[PDB]
Design an enzyme around this catalytic site. Structure first.
Site, PDB file in Angstrom:
ATOM      1  N   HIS A  60       0.852  -1.201   0.000  1.00 18.26           N
ATOM      2  CA  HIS A  60       0.000   0.000   0.000  1.00 18.26           C
ATOM      3  C   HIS A  60       0.878   1.238   0.000  1.00 18.26           C
ATOM      4  O   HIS A  60       1.622   1.489   0.971  1.00 18.26           O
ATOM      5  CB  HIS A  60      -0.971  -0.044   1.198  1.00 18.26           C
ATOM      6  CG  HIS A  60      -1.928   1.116   1.239  1.00 18.26           C
ATOM      7  ND1 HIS A  60      -2.890   1.307   0.273  1.00 18.26           N
ATOM      8  CD2 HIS A  60      -2.061   2.138   2.117  1.00 18.26           C
ATOM      9  CE1 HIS A  60      -3.595   2.393   0.558  1.00 18.26           C
ATOM     10  NE2 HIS A  60      -3.108   2.924   1.670  1.00 18.26           N
ATOM     11  N   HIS A 441      -6.888   9.329  -0.623  1.00 21.45           N
ATOM     12  CA  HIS A 441      -7.565   9.223   0.681  1.00 21.45           C
ATOM     13  C   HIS A 441      -6.801   9.845   1.875  1.00 21.45           C
ATOM     14  O   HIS A 441      -7.278   9.740   3.018  1.00 21.45           O
ATOM     15  CB  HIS A 441      -7.970   7.748   0.948  1.00 21.45           C
ATOM     16  CG  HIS A 441      -6.790   6.805   1.019  1.00 21.45           C
ATOM     17  ND1 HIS A 441      -6.266   6.164  -0.096  1.00 21.45           N
ATOM     18  CD2 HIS A 441      -6.042   6.409   2.075  1.00 21.45           C
ATOM     19  CE1 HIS A 441      -5.224   5.441   0.278  1.00 21.45           C
ATOM     20  NE2 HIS A 441      -5.100   5.536   1.596  1.00 21.45           N
TER      21      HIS A 441
END
Ligand SMILES: *[C@@H]1O[C@H](CO)[C@@H](O)[C@H](O)[C@H]1NC(C)=O
Ligand SMILES: CS[C@@H]1[C@@H](N)[C@@H](O)[C@@H](O)[C@H]1O
Ligand SMILES: [Zn+2]
EC number: 3.2.1.114
Length: 1015
Positions: A60, A441
């Site tokens: 990630h 995000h």
């Protein structure tokens, strides 16, 4: 067209319905803390029915969070990608998935040719697989659907060009809650599957119990199911390795081979991984397979997804080795021991989904249908992640400004083909990419470190300047006689004038048009209307004299109003907040009328005295202890008085009554009608002194909000024929109600100053009998029914307000439209509230490692629409959607896509023309051209132009409102040779269109078309 109002979809899981039934008890489930002790039958799997396990390596990579994009790229991501390339090249069996194309493009462009070729080969051969393929993994709460599309298209266009692949599976493991806007866009962009993770722990438990974690997710209004996209919800608390092998993280953590000591990582459950050997492999496999079989019980097929990764993983060569070698020893044992009846291997996300659907087609499983959303997320206890609906609201508002400037720049410049030296493609690409990055995000969410927020702001500022350059070059070309047009592509022919960004009191950034007998008699200004219908809107400019009149390009007079330029000052001497007037700058306001997707030119001319067609507003300053307020040549003296209730009405519109503190008290729609109570109030929420603290993510109020003590605020009333307003200097907020003859506009200049541990809320109090129902939008695309639940804490009843919210009863509706995403709710019948800013001293223990103390003045904008709805054809009581009226939709458009204003920079514009686009079709009001983008550079023989067409759905309330024209986007440019319907990213042709005509779309539908031109 499907009817989106009158047919309630029949689905297996409807999230509002599920919410109404669920208990949300937070009980200790054992090792699976938010679940239960999973049991399985060992005999379920056998030689004829094995469990197929796909271990999917991933990493990630946030495009900014604790470090900036470039800092992470240098410190982590370039090494991760370089080592992925080397390790997958050297180990043909190893697999890896990649999501964030912003990083991948940065990396790939820096590779030597030999390594570019190696990279293409490991993608072509299926070892490295792109998932989603957007520029980022966007926030799903605050993002506008237009920008989710923009960033998806930016990443996928790069992938098609350089990798020759278009992902059809999406991977969204980290946004803080999930929106059905995602399957809506993905399904219209060629996708077949998607995965999500951060959903309320109670929802995971509930769906797990029913094996409903895999579902066909359709839109809430979709009766037939053609919007449906197969979705996999992961079951556990995190996507990290401890929470992805199975229910017991103390066990799964022992299978994260980076946690043995040398990498500085450990297992919080106090049992470390051990290197797999021939002597421990059996017992280790016993343990791991038991976890896998427990996880598999929560799903319907014999194919099991096991992600293997975490944040910025797979950096070091030794890390690739330690994970790969240990997993390979496990696979060799497990796969050779028939008693397990498992076949386990490294795989990709697509491989997982393909095998799931193979099991489906074999009749082994059928999946439930689901509609609804997954807000508001809580990861544990009462920790609901509603704070980020408001955090860093300056940049949330900036997002919506840049959204519109990117649209206007792409559209204005799409009309022509440009020489490479004009740098049009270059500037547009920079603007798209910086806006796309901010969809991350940790960007628009306001959850990044202070210096990262600064980086996103600087990037967006450069993007705005890029848009302005392209816009103004385009205006100059579109409105100059072609045989006169003589461009210097570096020159500024026009400057943009924007009244609401950064906004008065945020930046004295507005240029004054300087006119004078001894310098310059007049000035040309041009308005652009990006919407595909004729539009009138009042526009204002600053000018150096009050004696200014307006004409159009036929020299017809245009009615205008002049008002002073008022600025508010916090006076540290008198300890008051009060307005000062300019004695050399004035505001001129007039109605601009602009063609669909077009331009209109006007002229402002000075005279030595009051012009025939210009009026002057009166001004009334209400406060005790007044002092003079001179205004230079302004022809009407300011009046003074003690605070008092006042009433205003512009044109034939509503009459608004205000309290002596300058706040709305009532709206009267027509001469006859009731004064409907509609009260604005500002309140403050605090932070808990014991227990968990609010931070960038979490909203943890110490109870219901308390009223802001207002003292005796100074109130300024400006009354004009075209525009009136009431402005009041409240603590932390200069609050303005503006009237132009329809729904008022509200502007708040919000400066929370040094009020630590404070959240400022704006509340509307009405007597509307809304009960426990209210409506908020998802990504500016659709409105969803909410039900306030007293079984949940206050912060759980907060929802994203990305563009609008409303309450209604049988007769009356109140809609508040926004120019920025903020959080809000309806905490009691008749109420609406929306947070303005929040300043928090404490960190909220999610890894950000700071509070929110970097607040800056922001100008929030709104429209407030009170309407009778007793005649409207509304959905039934069981329908999960709601729909705007015509007035509320137009009000939203006025905030998100206003007219653009350009001021000619030089003294004289030779060859100037009065209008562009007068022959463009004026489409029905519910239709928009969301995107117009030329897709080819000037060297292409066949020019191609892409259009995204969106039709919203507006309520039928008895207004005949008709006479419009069919809009065929494929014929907007001349010499059309082909018209194709495409995916929304323009990357795949879906339909070759008869007669080269692009049909209009159905309500709530979005389509894309590409026209090809031979010229
Ligand atoms: C791109 O992918 C398609 C997929 O079928 C393939 O046919 C085509 O040759 C590819 N182009 C290359 C290898 O650059
Ligand atoms: C919510 S924790 C989350 C981390 N997983 C990191 O990726 C960043 O996005 C941060 O916001
Ligand atoms: Zn993240």
């Amino acid at each position: 067209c499907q009817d989106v109002v009158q047919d309630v979809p029949n689905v297996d899981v409807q999230m509002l319905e599920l919410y109404d039934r669920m208990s949300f008890k937070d009980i200790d489930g054992g090792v699976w803390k938010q679940g239960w002790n999973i049991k399985y039958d060992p005999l379920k799997y056998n030689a004829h029915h094995k469990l197929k396990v796909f271990v999917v390596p991933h990493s990630h990579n946030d495009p900014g969070w604790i470090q900036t994009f470039e800092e992470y790229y240098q410190h982590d991501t370039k090494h991760i990608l370089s080592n992925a390339l080397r390790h997958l090249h050297d180990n043909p069996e190893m697999k890896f998935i990649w999501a964030e194309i912003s990083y991948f493009a940065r990396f790939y462009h820096d590779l030597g040719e030999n390594k570019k070729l190696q990279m293409k080969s490991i993608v072509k051969n299926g070892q490295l697989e792109f998932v989603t393929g957007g520029w980022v993994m966007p926030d799903e709460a605050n993002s506008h659907w237009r920008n989710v599309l923009l960033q998806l298209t930016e990443g996928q266009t790069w992938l098609k060009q350089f990798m020759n692949v278009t992902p059809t599976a999406s991977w969204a493991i980290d946004p803080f809650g999930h929106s059905p806007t995602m399957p809506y866009i993905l399904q219209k962009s060629g996708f077949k599957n998607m995965l999500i993770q951060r959903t309320h722990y109670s929802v995971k438990k509930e769906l797990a119990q029913q094996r409903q974690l895999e579902f066909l997710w359709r839109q809430i209004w979709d009766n037939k199911g053609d919007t449906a996209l197969f979705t996999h919800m992961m079951p556990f608390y995190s996507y990290d390795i401890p929470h992805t092998c199975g229910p017991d993280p103390k066990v799964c953590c022992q299978f994260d081979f980076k946690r043995m000591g040398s990498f500085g990582l450990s297992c919080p459950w106090k049992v470390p991984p051990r290197t797999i050997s021939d002597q421990n492999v059996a017992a280790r496999s016993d343990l791991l397979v038991d976890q896998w079989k427990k996880k598999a019980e929560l799903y319907r097929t014999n194919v099991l997804l096991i992600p293997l990764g975490d944040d910025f993983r797979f950096k070091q060569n030794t890390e690739w080795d330690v994970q790969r070698v240990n997993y390979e020893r496990l696979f060799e044992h497990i796969n050779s021991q028939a008693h397990f009846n498992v076949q386990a291997q490294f795989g990709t996300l697509q491989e997982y989904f393909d095998a799931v659907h193979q099991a489906e087609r074999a009749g082994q499983a059928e999946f439930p249908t689901l509609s609804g959303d997954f807000f508001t997320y809580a990861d544990r206890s009462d920790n609901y992640w509603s704070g980020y609906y408001t955090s860093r609201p300056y940049h949330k508002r900036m997002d919506r400004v840049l959204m519109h400037y990117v649209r206007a720049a792409e559209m204005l410049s799409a009309w022509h083909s440009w020489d490479g030296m004009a740098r049009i493609e270059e500037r547009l690409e920079q603007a798209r990419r910086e806006l796309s990055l901010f969809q991350h995000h940790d960007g628009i969410t306001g959850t990044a470190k202070t210096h990262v927020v600064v980086d996103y702001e600087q990037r967006m500022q450069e993007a705005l300047k890029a848009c302005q350059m392209v816009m103004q070059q385009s205006v100059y070309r579109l409105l100059t006689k072609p045989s006169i047009y003589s461009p210097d592509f570096s020159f500024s022919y026009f400057t943009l004038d924007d009244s609401r960004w950064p906004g008065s009191g945020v930046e004295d950034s507005r240029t004054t048009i300087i006119l004078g007998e001894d310098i310059l008699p007049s000035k040309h200004v041009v308005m652009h209307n990006t919407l595909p219908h004729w539009r009138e809107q009042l526009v204002d400019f600053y000018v150096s004299s009050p004696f200014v009149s307006v004409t159009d390009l036929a020299n017809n007079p245009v009615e205008a109003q002049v008002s002073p330029v008022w600025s508010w000052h916090h006076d540290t001497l008198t300890k008051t907040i009060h307005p000062q007037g300019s004695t050399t700058k004035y505001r001129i306001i007039f109605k601009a009328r602009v063609p669909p997707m077009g331009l209109a030119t006007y002229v402002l001319t000075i005279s030595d005295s009051k012009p025939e067609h210009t009026s002057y507003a009166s001004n009334l300053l209400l406060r005790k202890n007044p002092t003079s307020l001179p205004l230079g040549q302004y022809p009407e003296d300011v009046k003074f008085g003690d605070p008092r209730e006042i009433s205003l009405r512009v044109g034939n519109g509503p009459t608004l009554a205000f309290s002596e503190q300058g706040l709305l008290k009532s709206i009267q729609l027509t001469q006859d009608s009731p004064h409907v109570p509609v009260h604005f109030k500002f309140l403050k929420y605090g932070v808990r002194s014991h227990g968990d603290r609010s931070g960038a993510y979490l909203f943890l109020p110490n109870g219901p909000a308390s009223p802001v003590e207002l003292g005796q605020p100074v109130v300024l009333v400006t009354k004009g024929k075209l525009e009136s307003s009431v402005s009041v200097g409240l603590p932390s907020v200069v609050h303005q109600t503006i009237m132009r003859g329809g729904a008022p506009e509200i502007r708040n200049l919000v400066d929370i100053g040094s009020l630590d541990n404070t959240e400022i809320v704006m509340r509307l109090e009405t007597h509307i009998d809304s009960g426990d129902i209210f409506y908020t939008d998802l990504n500016g695309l659709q409105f969803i029914k909410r039900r306030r639940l007293d079984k949940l804490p206050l912060q759980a009843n907060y929802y994203p307000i990305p563009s609008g919210m409303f309450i209604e009863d049988a007769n009356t509706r109140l809609t508040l439209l926004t120019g920025q995403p903020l959080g809000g709710s309806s905490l009691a019948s008749g109420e609406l509230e929306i947070m303005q800013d929040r300043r928090l001293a404490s960190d909220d223990e999610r890894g950000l490692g700071q509070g929110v103390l970097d607040n800056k003045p922001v100008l929030h904008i709104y429209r407030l629409v009170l309407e009778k709805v007793n005649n409207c054809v509304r959905p039934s009581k069981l329908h999960p959607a709601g729909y705007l009226t015509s007035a509320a939709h137009k009000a939203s458009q006025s905030l998100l896509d206003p007219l653009d204003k350009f001021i000619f920079a030089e003294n004289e514009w030779i060859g100037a023309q009065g209008q562009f686009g007068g022959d463009h079709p004026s489409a029905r009001e519910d239709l928009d051209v969301s995107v117009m983008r030329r897709l080819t550079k000037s060297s292409a023989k066949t020019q191609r132009v892409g259009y995204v067409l969106h039709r919203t759905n507006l309520m039928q309330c008895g207004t005949p409102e008709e006479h419009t024209q069919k809009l065929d986007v494929c014929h907007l440019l001349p010499n059309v040779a082909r018209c194709e319907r495409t995916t929304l990213t323009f990357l795949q042709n879906l339909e070759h269109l008869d007669g080269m005509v692009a049909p209009e779309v159905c309500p709530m539908e979005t389509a894309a078309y590409v026209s090809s031109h031979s010229s």
